[PDB]
Amino acid sequence: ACDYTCGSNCYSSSDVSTAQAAGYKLHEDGETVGSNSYPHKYNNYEGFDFSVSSPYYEWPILSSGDVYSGGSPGADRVVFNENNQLAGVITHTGASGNNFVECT
Ligand SMILES: [Ca+2]
Structure with missing residues (x-):
């Protein structure tokens, strides 16, 4: 199973x-x-x-x-903060121009 799915890309927490x-x-x-x-x-x-x-x-x-x-x-993309904490996994797939949607 995918921990995060961006469009049709599947990622695990290790990725x-x-x-x-x-x-x-x-x-x-x-x-x-x-x-x-x-x-x-x-x-x-x-x-x-x-x-x-x-x-x-x-x-x-x-x-x-x-x-x-x-x-x-x-x-x-992975988004992290200044303290190296993960904020989320997002993608340009399915969003117009430079906008983003979250991976699910
Ligand atoms: Ca992988």
């Missing part, structure tokens, strides 16, 4: 813990990867009910299970 660790280490190093420079700040204008406080940062989670290292980021 999310692995992506968050990689994204949080780049935040501590003051580094980014990719043409769109991830991780970067996430603004919660859609109002998802996250139970952890901001600031928030978005980082890609790949359907393949690999950690993101550049190239296409796909449409799914």
Whole structure:
């Protein structure tokens, strides 16, 4: 079963813990990867009910299970805060433009 489903991509809690660790280490190093420079700040204008406080940062989670290292980021993201707490799993799949919906 999937712990998180984004569109038709299925992720387990191991997949999310692995992506968050990689994204949080780049935040501590003051580094980014990719043409769109991830991780970067996430603004919660859609109002998802996250139970952890901001600031928030978005980082890609790949359907393949690999950690993101550049190239296409796909449409799914883990959002974590400044204290390395997971806020949620969201995706651009099924939302217009740069908006997001939550994975279920
Ligand atoms: Ca997986």
